[PDB]
Amino acid sequence: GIFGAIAGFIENGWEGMVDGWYGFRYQNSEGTGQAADLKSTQAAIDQINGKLNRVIERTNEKFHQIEKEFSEVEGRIQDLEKYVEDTKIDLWSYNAELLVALENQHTIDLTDAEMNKLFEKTRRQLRENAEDMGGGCFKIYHKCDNACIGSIRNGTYDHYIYRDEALNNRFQI
Amino acid sequence: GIFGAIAGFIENGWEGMVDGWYGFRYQNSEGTGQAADLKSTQAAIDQINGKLNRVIERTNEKFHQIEKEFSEVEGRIQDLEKYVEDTKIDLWSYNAELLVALENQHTIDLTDAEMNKLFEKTRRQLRENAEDMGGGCFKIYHKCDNACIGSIRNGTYDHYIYRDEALNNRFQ
Amino acid sequence: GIFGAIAGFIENGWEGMVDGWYGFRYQNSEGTGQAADLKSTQAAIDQINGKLNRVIERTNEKFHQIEKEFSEVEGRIQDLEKYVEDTKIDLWSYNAELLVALENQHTIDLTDAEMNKLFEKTRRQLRENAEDMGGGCFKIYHKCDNACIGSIRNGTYDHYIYRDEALNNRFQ
Amino acid sequence: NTATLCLGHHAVANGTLVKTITDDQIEVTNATELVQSISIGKICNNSYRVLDGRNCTLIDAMLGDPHCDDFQYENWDLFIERSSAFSNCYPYDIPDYASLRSIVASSGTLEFTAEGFTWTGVTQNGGSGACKRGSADSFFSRLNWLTKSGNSYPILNVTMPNNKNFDKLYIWGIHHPSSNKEQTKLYIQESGRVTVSTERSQQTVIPNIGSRPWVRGQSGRISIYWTIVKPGDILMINSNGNLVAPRGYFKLRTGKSSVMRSDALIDTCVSECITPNGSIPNDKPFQNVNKITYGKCPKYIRQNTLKLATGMRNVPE
Amino acid sequence: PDQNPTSGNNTATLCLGHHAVANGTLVKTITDDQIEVTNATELVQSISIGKICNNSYRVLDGRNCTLIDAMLGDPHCDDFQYENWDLFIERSSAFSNCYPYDIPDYASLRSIVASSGTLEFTAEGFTWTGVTQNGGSGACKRGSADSFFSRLNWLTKSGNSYPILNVTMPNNKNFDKLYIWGIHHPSSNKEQTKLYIQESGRVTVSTERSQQTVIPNIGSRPWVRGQSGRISIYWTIVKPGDILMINSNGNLVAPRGYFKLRTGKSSVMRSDALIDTCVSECITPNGSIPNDKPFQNVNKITYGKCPKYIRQNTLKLATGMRNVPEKQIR
Amino acid sequence: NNTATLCLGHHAVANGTLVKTITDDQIEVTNATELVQSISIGKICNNSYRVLDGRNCTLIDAMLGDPHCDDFQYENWDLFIERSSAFSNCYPYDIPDYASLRSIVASSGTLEFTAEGFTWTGVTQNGGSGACKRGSADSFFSRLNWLTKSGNSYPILNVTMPNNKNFDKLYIWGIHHPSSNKEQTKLYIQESGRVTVSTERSQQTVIPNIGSRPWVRGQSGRISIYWTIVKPGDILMINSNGNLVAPRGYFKLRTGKSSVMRSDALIDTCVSECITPNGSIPNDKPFQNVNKITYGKCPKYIRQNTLKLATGMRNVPEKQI
Numbered sequence A: 001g002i003f004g005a006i007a008g009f010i011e012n013g014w015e016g017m018v019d020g021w022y023g024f025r026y027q028n029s030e031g032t033g034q035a036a037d038l039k040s041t042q043a044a045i046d047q048i049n050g051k052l053n054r055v056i057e058r059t060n061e062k063f064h065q066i067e068k069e070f071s072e073v074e075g076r077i078q079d080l081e082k083y084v085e086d087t088k089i090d091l092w093s094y095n096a097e098l099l100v101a102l103e104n105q106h107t108i109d110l111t112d113a114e115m116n117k118l119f120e121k122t123r124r125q126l127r128e129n130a131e132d133m134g135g136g137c138f139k140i141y142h143k144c145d146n147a148c149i150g151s152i153r154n155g156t157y158d159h160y161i162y163r164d165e166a167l168n169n170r171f172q173i
Numbered sequence B, C: 001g002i003f004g005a006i007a008g009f010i011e012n013g014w015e016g017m018v019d020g021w022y023g024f025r026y027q028n029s030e031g032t033g034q035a036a037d038l039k040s041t042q043a044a045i046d047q048i049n050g051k052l053n054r055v056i057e058r059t060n061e062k063f064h065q066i067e068k069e070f071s072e073v074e075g076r077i078q079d080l081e082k083y084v085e086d087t088k089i090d091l092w093s094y095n096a097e098l099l100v101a102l103e104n105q106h107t108i109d110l111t112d113a114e115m116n117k118l119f120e121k122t123r124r125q126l127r128e129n130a131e132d133m134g135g136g137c138f139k140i141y142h143k144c145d146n147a148c149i150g151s152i153r154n155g156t157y158d159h160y161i162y163r164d165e166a167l168n169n170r171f172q
Numbered sequence D: 001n002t003a004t005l006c007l008g009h010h011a012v013a014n015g016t017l018v019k020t021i022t023d024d025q026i027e028v029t030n031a032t033e034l035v036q037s038i039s040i041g042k043i044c045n046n047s048y049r050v051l052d053g054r055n056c057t058l059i060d061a062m063l064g065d066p067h068c069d070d071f072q073y074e075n076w077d078l079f080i081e082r083s084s085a086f087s088n089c090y091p092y093d094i095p096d097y098a099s100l101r102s103i104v105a106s107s108g109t110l111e112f113t114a115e116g117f118t119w120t121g122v123t124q125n126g127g128s129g130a131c132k133r134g135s136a137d138s139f140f141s142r143l144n145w146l147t148k149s150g151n152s153y154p155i156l157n158v159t160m161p162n163n164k165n166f167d168k169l170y171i172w173g174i175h176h177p178s179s180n181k182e183q184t185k186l187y188i189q190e191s192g193r194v195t196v197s198t199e200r201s202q203q204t205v206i207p208n209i210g211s212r213p214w215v216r217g218q219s220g221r222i223s224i225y226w227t228i229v230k231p232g233d234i235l236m237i238n239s240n241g242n243l244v245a246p247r248g249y250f251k252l253r254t255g256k257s258s259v260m261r262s263d264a265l266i267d268t269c270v271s272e273c274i275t276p277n278g279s280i281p282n283d284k285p286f287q288n289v290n291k292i293t294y295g296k297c298p299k300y301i302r303q304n305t306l307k308l309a310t311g312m313r314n315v316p317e
Numbered sequence E: 001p002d003q004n005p006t007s008g009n010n011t012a013t014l015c016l017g018h019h020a021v022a023n024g025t026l027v028k029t030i031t032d033d034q035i036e037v038t039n040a041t042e043l044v045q046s047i048s049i050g051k052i053c054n055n056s057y058r059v060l061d062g063r064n065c066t067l068i069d070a071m072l073g074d075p076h077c078d079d080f081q082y083e084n085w086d087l088f089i090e091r092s093s094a095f096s097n098c099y100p101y102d103i104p105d106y107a108s109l110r111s112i113v114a115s116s117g118t119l120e121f122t123a124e125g126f127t128w129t130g131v132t133q134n135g136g137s138g139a140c141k142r143g144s145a146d147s148f149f150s151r152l153n154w155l156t157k158s159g160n161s162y163p164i165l166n167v168t169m170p171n172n173k174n175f176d177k178l179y180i181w182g183i184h185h186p187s188s189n190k191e192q193t194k195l196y197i198q199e200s201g202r203v204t205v206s207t208e209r210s211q212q213t214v215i216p217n218i219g220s221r222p223w224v225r226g227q228s229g230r231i232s233i234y235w236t237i238v239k240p241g242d243i244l245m246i247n248s249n250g251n252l253v254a255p256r257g258y259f260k261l262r263t264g265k266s267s268v269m270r271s272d273a274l275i276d277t278c279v280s281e282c283i284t285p286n287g288s289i290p291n292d293k294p295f296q297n298v299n300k301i302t303y304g305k306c307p308k309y310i311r312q313n314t315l316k317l318a319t320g321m322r323n324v325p326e327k328q329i330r
Numbered sequence F: 001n002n003t004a005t006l007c008l009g010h011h012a013v014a015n016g017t018l019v020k021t022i023t024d025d026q027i028e029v030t031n032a033t034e035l036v037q038s039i040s041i042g043k044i045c046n047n048s049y050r051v052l053d054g055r056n057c058t059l060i061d062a063m064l065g066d067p068h069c070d071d072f073q074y075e076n077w078d079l080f081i082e083r084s085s086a087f088s089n090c091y092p093y094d095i096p097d098y099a100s101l102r103s104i105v106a107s108s109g110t111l112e113f114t115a116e117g118f119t120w121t122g123v124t125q126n127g128g129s130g131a132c133k134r135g136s137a138d139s140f141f142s143r144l145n146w147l148t149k150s151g152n153s154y155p156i157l158n159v160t161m162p163n164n165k166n167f168d169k170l171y172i173w174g175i176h177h178p179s180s181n182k183e184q185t186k187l188y189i190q191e192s193g194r195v196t197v198s199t200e201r202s203q204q205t206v207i208p209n210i211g212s213r214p215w216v217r218g219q220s221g222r223i224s225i226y227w228t229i230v231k232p233g234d235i236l237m238i239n240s241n242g243n244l245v246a247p248r249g250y251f252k253l254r255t256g257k258s259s260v261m262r263s264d265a266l267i268d269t270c271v272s273e274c275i276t277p278n279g280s281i282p283n284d285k286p287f288q289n290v291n292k293i294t295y296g297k298c299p300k301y302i303r304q305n306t307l308k309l310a311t312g313m314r315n316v317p318e319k320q321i
């Protein structure tokens, strides 16, 4: 991926996240927890569904055409009737080879993108109350129960509430 | 957008900004103001002009070709003439449809990129003197009147001048 | 490119760097040195070689076809023959023009991306012990000798060893 | 007094490999096939109107070969010709057979309309033991074989205006005898001729006496020709011998119908795409079953498989 | 108070953002069928000027004349005698007004003459000893007198003789001669023997490379301008150094000379569009179109420097960013 | 000092190479690779494919059996080369749909011929001509038999030849067009000739065409060549009462990957899998600009003469020097 999040600074995928594509795992004073992010999941799916709808069931209607298999040997114009059809098939075969290559390179880059978007979004909410440990993990420097974590997932986390407590833990020792 | 800036972490665009494609809006001790960034605006427009140059006013000359409309019914050879033209038109229709799809996806992506580049450039200038509020907005932790904001817009803002004052408002 | 690292916030490349595509320069208590990063370098090359495989030695075998040059004038069925071949050549010409365009755009964007990835990987290692100066350069805030620099380059730099030293240097 | 919040993506036990711009094989969580490579195995008849030619070629059904009488006023979206088809009437050739076959096939109908041509001084409705209709000697139902009446065969001069608003297809021919004695016996004149003309165009044909190979008892032959007469125009037939006269016109439509060669069984099912191998679904953009197709069909390509990724990069433990 | 336009004396807010417009336009992408951007440009030309511009290429209005009728020399097409063109325009209201004819492979000849781009003709002293020349008909009136195609010579019996005509004419020029000739099909046996003596005519036009033999075909055709007979036109091309030879014992409609064949970039087009003083590098049957855009939906039939014909009537190319408007409510 | 600066960057070269992109007409990268083959070796390489030099012969004259083309009697090929200097030095002829016949034989890639014992009773055989000298004898096309009247008369010929095989036969035959009626009568008795080559599927009647033509090697007469394919089970038949230039046998029709090409380039030993009229070309690049006419495993012909694919990053040299 072009952002190096998926198969990058995040070491691997969570097989046990079965209700979403992207999400959170947390440890705090109440236990451990996991939750899918429905928003970043839905973004990726919609884009992929868009790709599908422009490729799938967009078929042409075609009726009488030219002949393409022949009993007798005829020479000049049968040469042309075969050359035309051969030229067409080779061209459509190129188009399909390229389309798939392009669409797949893109599908990978946009999925990598949504992962990085979620990260940066979360980093912005946490502000001075957390540091980036690597592996896609934040160290949060204050007591943050499941409600606190829920507010981060909701995007209503008020950093001023904990800022004093958090800056004290970061610049200790 | 692939960087999630435009129609992303920046909630929406500004209709009042007629002097540029990207820019700044600020609040400070003198009031509120608005100013465009001509360098990021120009980067986006130039890339988009590059596409136009590749596609606009580029046409081949063709002269005598084949017939494509027929008065009588003839059979084999007319079938071929029609199939050839019908094959060519289908392939060019596909080329145009795909050309436009890819270029638009890219255009959207590169303008989103220039928005993100501008933020990242500005972030680097402010160094330890400001924090990301979110929404593409910086809270600057020192007094910054219109000259001071202008130095950021000119790229001549020396963070060392306000560093000590700023740190002391950030943590205390 | 689209990340704005190469021909972007990094002013220019290093002709002196001959053993790799990306890497580090540094000054410290033991003078100054240069060293290439192999993982990032190899990632770009593997991607680029990948493209070469799709394009090099990918050839079709063709035998009897149609005549493409003519002695006499014959009209209709010769007009069709020349038009078929002419139609075919323009379409392949377009295919070629576009392939090279999209690939080269993508080659530039992916090699820029790797530059950025390397930067973000170093930033995450250094954590609070360094600040982004700009120009693709970090200011590490502690006595980091060649063994220490080596650890960053090797991805084994333990920021907790130098934290209290560097945190003190940044804010006092 | 602290907490850890890790962000991540999902993954599946066993993903599937795909091609990218930079990779031959890279694993993703899911993918979908874009090449239709299997077929139903039979031609579906509840989408388009498919007509089984059985033992008859489209041309024989047109002409009126006795054993093809079942097809007299039929119409189709797709006419299926079988490889076990055969002709069982007077031996014949059609110069530019493929074009007549294409024209009729596209029109999609054998709607015939007899017309009162005034053939005087000749005996009409000639027959042959090579074209039996029941126990009796007969001939192509849409063709009228003229021979001398009494002791003569006049210079026939008959016309028929097209007062309709559609193009009329007229099928006619000439008879080639097996000897000079046969030529003069049937037609009196030692040399035959047939000139079918309009105001814009014309076709003249001289017969050619002498034996050919033996076909159902006969060494003689006929050659089939056609003339398309436009609205406002006029058909004229002038001949002093060997004319195989038309009985009327076929009605030409500018239709979306066609003809196809296949030995595939025809059965109740639904599918808007027909190939010689059988019907195929059209959910996918491309196919690899057959370049010969009719209906809403995926485009034929050389590759039998192309996987499009419908998920992110799969990276398990 | 709360309308205070400043910040709190020790701080400031700097916000980064982008422009937007009140009226965006929708474009297509890889992921989205319809997505709104700040603006776009049309890549498909779907409007015609309504007429054929004639300052760029030389456009020749055929008026009442087809290219073939102008070539053959149908009396009412005599104004096209020595003309040339980049593009010849044939009208739907054109008509033939000379002796009724057919041309086997009519389309090919039309193509051959159209691509050549010129009708420049040169007469030649063909010696036709033993026959009457300049045959005419009431179906082809030049003035009030019976006449014929001006580039053709209808040969008939002189008294009691129609000999085996044996004529040569070599090409001592550096270009290909195009020869137009024909054969007369009469309506009856009485007419055949009357005009040509012989019962069954023949025409053999030949060179060292090729040859064509044609036989007349007696029998009445439909009445066309009072005439039941017909004529069939054929052509022969003679190369430098080669030599035309014409042999016939009856029914020959002879040539008066050759047409000069050029390797050309010219053509012919069917259109009822008015022709006018303007400038355009691309012509269609509908009229001229501009060629700024890469594609077009006007007509698959085109001449000149033209955009490529596609089925789509519109394709929009984004020339601006995604549009995310300020006001949800206007 | 007890701090340190760690800088990042990328490599660069002194002079890179220009390439096209979506947004840039010309943009410099470190390196690139050419995707259009522009130059050719100059010789037709005759090591991958069997290349057969026509020299003074065309494929058609070889097939018929022009005396100077007797070298090609029983030969096969992948690619037959025709030279611009080739000529015909036998009886003057033409062939309706010449190109087709050339194409059918070329594709078949072989001049394998099996003679058959046709019986022509009532007529004299093996007619010759001074235009077609074999050695110094009035001869003729080796695969054709010119029939004339046997002294007194010329009867209605009627000869058959059934197909026992499991492959198609290619019969080559013709008809003579005399220069006068005094000839037509002299050679074939009847004032009116006619040839009718029929099968159980098809038939062709050709009528001769009396009248003089320009002199080619002294001769005013002409011959028109025709052909009839015959299928397994099907039975050839030949009716004629004058002017028949009869066939001596049939050619075998293989369905093959062979062809014919026009070129005046030298044919020489080398390694190459693709052939053009200009000479062979290497097929490592995907496209080529040499010639749209090609045979073998070839890059696709395009109108461009150069297309650089980027193999490295955006080259940003240092300007400090």
Ligand SMILES: *[C@@H]1O[C@H](CO)[C@@H](O[C@@H]2O[C@H](CO)[C@@H](O[C@@H]3O[C@H](CO[C@H]4O[C@H](CO)[C@@H](O)[C@H](O)[C@@H]4O)[C@@H](O)[C@H](O)[C@@H]3O)[C@H](O)[C@H]2NC(C)=O)[C@H](O)[C@H]1NC(C)=O
Binding pocket: D178, D179, D211, D212, D213, D214, D219, F158, F159, F160, F235
């Ligand atoms: C020109 O020469 C041709 C060949 O010599 C002549 O054609 C032949 O003419 C005779 C009539 O005189 C025909 O005789 C008939 O033969 C069939 C045979 O048909 C097939 O089927 C039977 C039964 O299964 C089988 O026994 C045979 O092997 C055949 O496969 C008989 O059924 C009839 O009773 C009758 O005897 C020939 O069939 C016919 N052959 C061909 C190939 O046309 C032609 O008549 C000559 N013309 C002149 C004017 O002399």
Ligand SMILES: *[C@@H]1O[C@H](CO)[C@@H](O[C@@H]2O[C@H](CO)[C@@H](O[C@@H]3O[C@H](CO[C@H]4O[C@H](CO)[C@@H](O)[C@H](O)[C@@H]4O)[C@@H](O)[C@H](O)[C@@H]3O)[C@H](O)[C@H]2NC(C)=O)[C@H](O)[C@H]1NC(C)=O
Binding pocket: D157, D158, D159, D234, E187, E188, E220, E221, E222, E223, E228
């Ligand atoms: C073979 O049959 C042919 C048709 O069955 C015969 O040809 C016909 O011959 C007659 C007598 O010569 C022609 O009569 C001519 O027709 C024109 C046409 O005028 C039209 O318009 C005017 C308008 O006022 C109107 O009066 C007429 O009714 C027509 O609508 C008349 O002006 C004259 O009367 C003129 O004599 C026929 O035109 C012609 N028809 C066709 C189709 O050719 C032919 O003679 C026969 N051949 C042999 C060898 O016997």
Ligand SMILES: *[C@@H]1O[C@H](CO)[C@@H](O[C@@H]2O[C@H](CO)[C@@H](O[C@@H]3O[C@H](CO[C@H]4O[C@H](CO)[C@@H](O)[C@H](O)[C@@H]4O)[C@@H](O)[C@H](O)[C@@H]3O)[C@H](O)[C@H]2NC(C)=O)[C@H](O)[C@H]1NC(C)=O
Binding pocket: E166, E167, E168, E243, F179, F180, F212, F213, F214, F215, F216
């Ligand atoms: C119908 O008219 C035709 C055209 O006029 C006649 O054809 C001509 O027939 C004469 C003989 O009767 C030919 O003359 C011969 O030419 C050859 C070769 O010509 C060259 O001869 C020498 C050697 O190079 C030199 O002087 C020049 O290069 C000549 O060009 C001579 O060798 C013979 O001796 C003889 O003179 C004509 O060539 C030929 N014309 C053409 C165009 O072919 C034909 O006789 C008439 N037929 C009937 C039935 O009436």
Ligand SMILES: CC(=O)N[C@@H]1[C@@H](O)[C@H](O[C@@H]2O[C@H](CO)[C@H](O)[C@H](O[C@]3(C(=O)O)C[C@H](O)[C@@H](NC(C)=O)[C@H]([C@H](O)[C@H](O)CO)O3)[C@H]2O)[C@@H](COS(=O)(=O)O)O[C@H]1O
Binding pocket: D126, D127, D128, D129, D130, D137, D145, D147, D176, D177, D178, D182, D186, D217, D218, D219, D220, D221
């Ligand atoms: C032992 C013997 O030879 N007995 C003879 C029979 O040969 C002769 O049979 C007829 O032979 C002729 C060939 O000369 C035809 O093959 C004819 O067959 C038909 C046919 O069925 O196709 C009969 C039709 O009534 C004819 N239809 C017409 C004229 O419209 C048709 C036609 O002439 C040919 O197809 C044209 O090529 O031929 C056999 O019946 C038998 C009858 O003699 S005849 O018919 O009065 O001449 O008499 C014994 O001679």
Ligand SMILES: CC(=O)N[C@@H]1[C@@H](O)[C@H](O[C@@H]2O[C@H](CO)[C@H](O)[C@H](O[C@]3(C(=O)O)C[C@H](O)[C@@H](NC(C)=O)[C@H]([C@H](O)[C@H](O)CO)O3)[C@H]2O)[C@@H](COS(=O)(=O)O)O[C@H]1O
Binding pocket: E135, E136, E137, E138, E139, E146, E154, E156, E185, E186, E187, E191, E195, E226, E227, E228, E229, E230
């Ligand atoms: C019986 C009646 O009501 N009226 C007749 C007229 O039919 C007859 O007119 C002539 O009819 C003959 C055919 O029999 C021709 O159509 C002729 O037309 C011309 C023409 O095209 O103008 C006359 C030309 O001089 C001929 N040109 C030549 C020979 O170069 C030309 C040519 O022969 C034919 O077109 C070839 O198909 O025909 C009508 O004028 C009228 C005069 O009789 S005739 O001219 O002596 O034959 O007699 C009335 O009684």
Ligand SMILES: CC(=O)N[C@@H]1[C@@H](O)[C@H](O[C@@H]2O[C@H](CO)[C@H](O)[C@H](O[C@]3(C(=O)O)C[C@H](O)[C@@H](NC(C)=O)[C@H]([C@H](O)[C@H](O)CO)O3)[C@H]2O)[C@@H](COS(=O)(=O)O)O[C@H]1O
Binding pocket: F127, F128, F129, F130, F131, F138, F146, F148, F177, F178, F179, F183, F187, F218, F219, F220, F221, F222
């Ligand atoms: C009387 C006079 O002025 N001159 C004649 C010469 O023409 C004659 O030479 C012969 O000329 C005739 C022209 O009709 C032929 O071209 C003939 O050439 C051959 C040929 O092609 O070599 C001879 C062959 O033997 C013929 N092949 C046959 C019969 O199968 C062949 C054939 O007739 C034509 O190709 C048919 O188109 O023509 C020249 O020999 C000269 C020699 O005398 S002789 O007539 O040959 O006995 O003497 C004159 O009297």
Ligand SMILES: *[C@@H]1O[C@H](CO)[C@@H](OC2O[C@H](CO)[C@@H](O)[C@H](O)[C@H]2NC(C)=O)[C@H](O)[C@H]1NC(C)=O
Binding pocket: E063, E064
């Ligand atoms: C085209 O053909 C017309 C028919 O003869 C010709 O002459 C006339 O034009 C109109 C037709 O509605 C009328 O005024 C009258 O019938 C004819 N007038 C004459 C002959 O003086 C037109 O002039 C021809 N067109 C051109 C451009 O020459």
Ligand SMILES: *[C@@H]1O[C@H](CO)[C@@H](O[C@@H]2O[C@H](CO)[C@@H](O)[C@H](O)[C@H]2NC(C)=O)[C@H](O)[C@H]1NC(C)=O
Binding pocket: A069, D037, D038, D039, D276, D277, D288, D289, D290
């Ligand atoms: C559909 O039918 C076509 C035509 O019969 C098949 O093409 C044949 O494939 C076989 C098997 O490899 C070859 O031996 C033949 O040479 C082909 N025949 C012809 C006439 O080209 C095709 O394979 C079938 N496709 C299916 C069932 O998917």
Ligand SMILES: *[C@@H]1O[C@H](CO)[C@@H](O[C@@H]2O[C@H](CO)[C@@H](O)[C@H](O)[C@H]2NC(C)=O)[C@H](O)[C@H]1NC(C)=O
Binding pocket: E054, E055, E275, E276, E277
């Ligand atoms: C191009 O077309 C114009 C319009 O038909 C031609 O100019 C006209 O010429 C006629 C006389 O032949 C005048 O009566 C008109 O007044 C002219 N123009 C207009 C607009 O009325 C012009 O000659 C044509 N050809 C060229 C080469 O320009």
Ligand SMILES: *[C@@H]1O[C@H](CO)[C@@H](O[C@@H]2O[C@H](CO)[C@@H](O)[C@H](O)[C@H]2NC(C)=O)[C@H](O)[C@H]1NC(C)=O
Binding pocket: F046, F047, F267, F268, F269
């Ligand atoms: C390819 O064709 C060339 C062209 O002649 C052949 O080269 C010569 O062949 C002759 C005839 O046998 C020899 O005498 C020469 O010694 C050959 N070489 C040269 C340099 O003249 C060559 O043999 C052909 N090769 C193949 C494999 O067909």
Ligand SMILES: *[C@@H]1O[C@H](CO)[C@@H](O[C@@H]2O[C@H](CO)[C@@H](O)[C@H](O)[C@H]2NC(C)=O)[C@H](O)[C@H]1NC(C)=O
Binding pocket: F038, F277, F278, F289, F290, F291
């Ligand atoms: C290959 O040979 C062809 C001939 O088959 C050359 O074609 C000529 O190209 C020149 C370019 O200057 C044209 O002006 C001529 O009109 C062409 N002639 C013909 C007959 O086509 C071609 O140049 C050669 N290409 C190479 C060596 O790359």
Ligand SMILES: *[C@H]1O[C@H](CO)[C@@H](O[C@@H]2O[C@H](CO)[C@@H](O)[C@H](O)[C@H]2NC(C)=O)[C@H](O)[C@H]1NC(C)=O
Binding pocket: E039, E040, E041, E042, E319
């Ligand atoms: C966005 O694109 C539009 C539509 O293509 C531009 O409109 C063109 O602008 C040029 C330069 O001012 C005019 O000369 C053309 O007449 C316009 N074309 C059409 C079809 O209207 C427009 O300038 C661009 N910018 C904006 C802000 O809309």
Ligand SMILES: *[C@H]1O[C@H](CO)[C@@H](O[C@@H]2O[C@H](CO)[C@@H](O)[C@H](O)[C@H]2NC(C)=O)[C@H](O)[C@H]1NC(C)=O
Binding pocket: F031, F032, F033, F034, F311
């Ligand atoms: C990049 O540029 C050149 C030419 O593109 C390369 O030179 C070659 O190296 C490749 C390795 O794949 C070999 O195929 C050839 O031996 C060389 N020449 C070719 C392909 O024309 C090289 O890879 C790079 N730069 C250099 C050599 O400076």
Ligand SMILES: *[C@@H]1O[C@H](COC2O[C@@H](C)[C@@H](O)[C@@H](O)[C@@H]2O)[C@@H](O)[C@H](O)[C@H]1NC(C)=O
Binding pocket: B146, B147, B150, B151, B153, B154, B156
């Ligand atoms: C950048 O800013 C400095 C601050 O003064 C301003 O003057 C003008 C140009 C405004 O547009 C704002 O930038 C500031 O209010 C200038 O003194 C300095 O010259 C400027 N430098 C450059 C290179 O523009």
Ligand SMILES: *[C@@H]1O[C@H](CO)[C@@H](O)[C@H](O)[C@H]1NC(C)=O
Binding pocket: A146, A147, A148, A150, A151, A154, A155, A156
């Ligand atoms: C988000 O969750 C927090 C705590 O769980 C709660 O205070 C807040 O109301 C929630 N907001 C929304 C929009 O769900």
Ligand SMILES: *[C@@H]1O[C@H](CO)[C@@H](O)[C@H](O)[C@H]1NC(C)=O
Binding pocket: C146, C147, C148, C149, C150, C151, C154, C156
């Ligand atoms: C990398 O760097 C350190 C410090 O230079 C060195 O001692 C060590 O051997 C290396 N280890 C690894 C795992 O790369």
